[PDB]
Amino acid sequence: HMDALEIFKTLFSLVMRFSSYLPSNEEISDMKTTELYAFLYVALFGPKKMKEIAEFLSTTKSNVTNVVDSLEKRGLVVREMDPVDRRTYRVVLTEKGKEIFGEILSNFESLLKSVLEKFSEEDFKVVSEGFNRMVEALSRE
Amino acid sequence: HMDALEIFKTLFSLVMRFSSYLPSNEEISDMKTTELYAFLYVALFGPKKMKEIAEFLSTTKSNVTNVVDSLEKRGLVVREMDPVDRRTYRVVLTEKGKEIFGEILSNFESLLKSVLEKFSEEDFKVVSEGFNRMVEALSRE
Numbered sequence: 001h002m003d004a005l006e007i008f009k010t011l012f013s014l015v016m017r018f019s020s021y022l023p024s025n026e027e028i029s030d031m032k033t034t035e036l037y038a039f040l041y042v043a044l045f046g047p048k049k050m051k052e053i054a055e056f057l058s059t060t061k062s063n064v065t066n067v068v069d070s071l072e073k074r075g076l077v078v079r080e081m082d083p084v085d086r087r088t089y090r091v092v093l094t095e096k097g098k099e100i101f102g103e104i105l106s107n108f109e110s111l112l113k114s115v116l117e118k119f120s121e122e123d124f125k126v127v128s129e130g131f132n133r134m135v136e137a138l139s140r141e
Numbered sequence: 142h143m144d145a146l147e148i149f150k151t152l153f154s155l156v157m158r159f160s161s162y163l164p165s166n167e168e169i170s171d172m173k174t175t176e177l178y179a180f181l182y183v184a185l186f187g188p189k190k191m192k193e194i195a196e197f198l199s200t201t202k203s204n205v206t207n208v209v210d211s212l213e214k215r216g217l218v219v220r221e222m223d224p225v226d227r228r229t230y231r232v233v234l235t236e237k238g239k240e241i242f243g244e245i246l247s248n249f250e251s252l253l254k255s256v257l258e259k260f261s262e263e264d265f266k267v268v269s270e271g272f273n274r275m276v277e278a279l280s281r282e
């Protein structure tokens with residue numbers, strides 16, 4: 001008998017432990033949650049149109065301009081201009097943006113190395129199978 | 142071997158998928174990442190000493206007082222002396238802190254119901270076996 005609060009508490013303890021295997025980033029920590037989330041979207045799936053960021057952020061066009069403006073202020077992303085209409089052609093990572101995303105990538109490489117040292121090949125099969133099955137199931141509709 | 146970015150990308154896509162299953166909240170989206178982390182720690186596991194939050198935030202006393210001062214000015218938490226002790230103080234949730242956590246817990250339960258509706262008993266057995274095995278392996282040494 002295991003309520004939603006109990007799963008939350010377990011997930012958060014786990015995250016707490018990933019925090020213990022995962023270093024610091026000082027700009028990741030200053031970012032609001034939707035800024036980090038949009039930053040990672042562009043860093044991961046490449047340059048994006050405002051329209052794609054607006055769709056992705058399950059969010060509005062207004063709140064996207066705030067999020068991109070704030071990421072631009074921080075030096076992390078830039079708008080490339082369409083010279084025909086003076087509107088945004090894409091959001092892309094800046095140099096500083098790419099570097100920071102390397103800190104995050106690198107910290108996470110070293111989290112995995114630690115997790116993996118705690119897994120037997122058998123643990124790895126079981127955990128792996130359940131992760132693939134969840135991704136499979138959530139991709140269906 | 143495993144590349145760090147490959148698994149990250151697939152992890153983020155999953156979260157993305159969960160984003161669309163999890164009702165939004167105007168306070169959470171405006172909080173910084175470590176503010177939210179400290180807020181949930183107290184909301185999930187009760188009132189904490191500043192020491193407790195530092196040790197947890199794998200972080201400093203200074204940076205804890207800022208995260209807490211910030212949570213305090215959004216009206217979510219307050220530092221309170223112990224009635225009995227009289228000489229220890231802890232960060233506790235305000236009334237509004239509890240109302241926001243209630244929304245958050247409610248949204249999580251909703252996402253959980255949505256996820257669970259996409260699993261057969263067979264999908265569930267594999268997924269939760271994997272979950273259990275990961276929690277046990279990460280809790281070992």
Ligand SMILES: [Cl-]
Binds near residue numbers: 127268272
């Ligand atoms: Cl799993």
